[PDB]
Ligand binder design. Structure first.
Ligand code: NA
Ligand code: NA
Ligand code: NA
Length: 129
């Protein structure tokens, strides 16, 4: 499913991401935009053989099992394919574990390079939340 900007903001807010670990909703919408263009089916392969999945591009090297990333962890206890669902619950629950591991949203390279230090509130402007 390809989300609309406001539709995704509302779904993330309902799933408890607004101000989760001090990150306002605009940060999460901004990260989803540059990681996946709001497409839950997005996949991208990394140089090390691991793959990134879903709306927040969660990596199989640490967070999910895809059956093809040797010596990797599955810290979210889920198959990577569950992160491609039109229901964002699994992606959101896994992102909460990632953002709590010590590095905050810096775990998402696109957030650090394209969202951090910008007016992220603009990503939720006009939304009925
Ligand atoms: Na915001
Ligand atoms: Na591979
Ligand atoms: Na980047």
């Amino acid at each position: 499913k390809v989300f609309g900007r406001c539709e995704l903001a509302a779904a993330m807010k309902r799933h408890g991401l607004d101000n989760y670990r001090g990150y306002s909703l605009g940060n999460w919408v901004c990260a989803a935009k540059f990681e996946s263009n709001f497409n839950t089916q997005a996949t991208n392969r990394n140089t090390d053989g691991s793959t990134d999945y879903g709306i927040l591009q969660i990596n199989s090297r640490w967070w999910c099992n895809d059956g093809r990333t040797p010596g990797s962890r599955n810290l979210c206890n889920i198959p990577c394919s569950a992160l491609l669902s039109s229901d964002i619950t699994a992606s959101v629950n896994c992102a909460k574990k990632i953002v709590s591991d010590g590095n905050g949203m810096n775990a998402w390279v696109a957030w650090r390079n394209r969202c951090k230090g910008t007016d992220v509130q603009a990503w939720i402007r006009g939304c009925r939340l």
